[PDB]
Design an enzyme around this catalytic site. Structure first.
Site, PDB file in Angstrom:
ATOM      1  N   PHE A  36       0.795  -1.217   0.000  1.00 25.30           N
ATOM      2  CA  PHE A  36       0.000   0.000   0.000  1.00 25.30           C
ATOM      3  C   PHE A  36       0.830   1.269   0.000  1.00 25.30           C
ATOM      4  O   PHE A  36       0.320   2.310  -0.428  1.00 25.30           O
ATOM      5  CB  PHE A  36      -0.963   0.023   1.200  1.00 25.30           C
ATOM      6  CG  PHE A  36      -0.280   0.021   2.540  1.00 25.30           C
ATOM      7  CD1 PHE A  36       0.061  -1.174   3.152  1.00 25.30           C
ATOM      8  CD2 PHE A  36      -0.022   1.209   3.211  1.00 25.30           C
ATOM      9  CE1 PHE A  36       0.675  -1.182   4.383  1.00 25.30           C
ATOM     10  CE2 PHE A  36       0.598   1.206   4.438  1.00 25.30           C
ATOM     11  CZ  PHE A  36       0.944   0.009   5.028  1.00 25.30           C
ATOM     12  N   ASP A  37       2.077   1.231   0.458  1.00 24.87           N
ATOM     13  CA  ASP A  37       2.893   2.430   0.506  1.00 24.87           C
ATOM     14  C   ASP A  37       4.350   2.034   0.336  1.00 24.87           C
ATOM     15  O   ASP A  37       4.773   0.959   0.771  1.00 24.87           O
ATOM     16  CB  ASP A  37       2.682   3.194   1.820  1.00 24.87           C
ATOM     17  CG  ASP A  37       3.226   4.613   1.776  1.00 24.87           C
ATOM     18  OD1 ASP A  37       3.804   5.019   0.746  1.00 24.87           O
ATOM     19  OD2 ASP A  37       3.058   5.336   2.780  1.00 24.87           O
ATOM     20  N   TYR A  82      -4.909   1.696  13.381  1.00 25.73           N
ATOM     21  CA  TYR A  82      -6.170   2.020  12.726  1.00 25.73           C
ATOM     22  C   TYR A  82      -7.307   1.057  13.022  1.00 25.73           C
ATOM     23  O   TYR A  82      -8.390   1.252  12.464  1.00 25.73           O
ATOM     24  CB  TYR A  82      -5.970   2.089  11.199  1.00 25.73           C
ATOM     25  CG  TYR A  82      -5.126   3.239  10.696  1.00 25.73           C
ATOM     26  CD1 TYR A  82      -5.670   4.505  10.522  1.00 25.73           C
ATOM     27  CD2 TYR A  82      -3.785   3.052  10.384  1.00 25.73           C
ATOM     28  CE1 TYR A  82      -4.898   5.555  10.056  1.00 25.73           C
ATOM     29  CE2 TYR A  82      -3.005   4.094   9.921  1.00 25.73           C
ATOM     30  CZ  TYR A  82      -3.566   5.341   9.758  1.00 25.73           C
ATOM     31  OH  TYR A  82      -2.789   6.377   9.296  1.00 25.73           O
ATOM     32  N   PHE A  99       5.861  -3.840   7.928  1.00 24.15           N
ATOM     33  CA  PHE A  99       6.724  -2.758   7.476  1.00 24.15           C
ATOM     34  C   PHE A  99       8.160  -3.231   7.337  1.00 24.15           C
ATOM     35  O   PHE A  99       8.735  -3.777   8.283  1.00 24.15           O
ATOM     36  CB  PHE A  99       6.674  -1.573   8.433  1.00 24.15           C
ATOM     37  CG  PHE A  99       5.364  -0.868   8.442  1.00 24.15           C
ATOM     38  CD1 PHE A  99       5.038   0.018   7.430  1.00 24.15           C
ATOM     39  CD2 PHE A  99       4.457  -1.086   9.463  1.00 24.15           C
ATOM     40  CE1 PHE A  99       3.826   0.674   7.435  1.00 24.15           C
ATOM     41  CE2 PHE A  99       3.247  -0.430   9.477  1.00 24.15           C
ATOM     42  CZ  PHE A  99       2.928   0.449   8.460  1.00 24.15           C
TER      43      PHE A  99
END
Length: 107
Positions: A36-37, A82, A99
């Site tokens: 996603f990133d 989240y 991550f």
């Protein structure tokens, strides 16, 4: 519940403290899911300081537990980032994040 699996090399002594602005080549991954990133795509390696609650809680506690040159592997719990809300369209509610984090910084 920040669990650390560091890829070894670095120095293991330059620990992040308060009032310090540091530089991270992070890479976002959803567990059992796609990316996603990625800071490596934009190649502007995300300069940010420590302590002002800019980043999420799971990345913030994982930041100070590293050192210069190291390469960690975060596993963020839902309750710290989240998992009640979910970032709309990008992060679903009750999500567990992965991550790839390398600290190549100053200060």
């Amino acid at each position: 519940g920040v669990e650390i699996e560091t890829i070894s090399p670095g120095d293991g002594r330059t620990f992040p403290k308060k009032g310090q602005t540091c530089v991270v080549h992070y890479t976002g991954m959803l567990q059992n899911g796609k990316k996603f990133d990625s800071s490596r795509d934009r190649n502007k390696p995300f300069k940010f300081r420590i302590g002002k609650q800019e980043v999420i809680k799971g990345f913030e506690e994982g930041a100070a537990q590293m050192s210069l040159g190291q390469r960690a592997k975060l596993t963020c719990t839902p309750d710290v980032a989240y998992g009640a809300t979910g970032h709309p369209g990008v992060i679903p509610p009750n999500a567990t994040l992965i991550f790839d984090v390398e600290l190549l910084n100053l200060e």
